[PDB]
Amino acid sequence: MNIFEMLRIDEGLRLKIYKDTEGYYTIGIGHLLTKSPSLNAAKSELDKAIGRNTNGVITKDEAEKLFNQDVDAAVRGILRNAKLKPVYDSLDAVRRAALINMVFQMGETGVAGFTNSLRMLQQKRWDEAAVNLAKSRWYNQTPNRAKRTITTFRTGTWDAYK
Numbered sequence: 001m002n003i004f005e006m007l008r009i010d011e012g013l014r015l016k017i018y019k020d021t022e023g024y025y026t027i028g029i030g031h032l033l034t035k036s037p038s039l040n041a042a043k044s045e046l047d048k049a050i051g052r053n054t055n056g057v058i059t060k061d062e063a064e065k066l067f068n069q070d071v072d073a074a075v076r077g078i079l080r081n082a083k084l085k086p087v088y089d090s091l092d093a094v095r096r097a098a099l100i101n102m103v104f105q106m107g108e109t110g111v112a113g114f115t116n117s118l119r120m121l122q123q124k125r126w127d128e129a130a131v132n133l134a135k136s137r138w139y140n141q142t143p144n145r146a147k148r149t150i151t152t153f154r155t156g157t158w159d160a161y162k
């Protein structure tokens with residue numbers, strides 16, 4: 001198991017524009033297109049992202065390409081972030097993947113806002129961090145996926161994904 005396989009299980013793969021759990025236009029493997037309510041604004045962002053007139057549909061290769069960019073960006077965002085970087089550096093490989101997953105999902109700013117949780121992770125207080133992580137809109141809105149990430153943080157294993 002690795003970050004790619006982990007996020008692919010969590011996000012799934014869709015080749016046609018779809019709406020995410022928040023109702024936003026997305027495509028491929030959790031690639032957010034726009035928060036705008038316009039489907040046209042979504043196709044536009046899509047064509048721009050892919051470099052061709054897609055008419056809202058992409059191929060598997062194209063999906064995987066956006067995915068690779070998105071993972072790469074998540075990692076680089078963590079490393080550039082003063083709040084996130086020290087947490088990431090402190091963790092083991094498995095838990096690093098959990099942090100990347102959260103960043104992929106809610107963006108760097110979102111994650112950096114989990115001040116108390118971050119401190120607990122840095123301190124290696126696993127059970128405590130897991131409890132604090134659950135007291136969030138994140139957990140309440142997407143509980144099954146949040147539990148998988150939380151368990152990963154708590155245990156340091158891939159059990160939740162197997």
Ligand SMILES: [Cl-]
Pocket residue numbers: 049
């Ligand atoms: Cl892009």
Ligand SMILES: [Cl-]
Pocket residue numbers: 141142143144145146
């Ligand atoms: Cl869920």
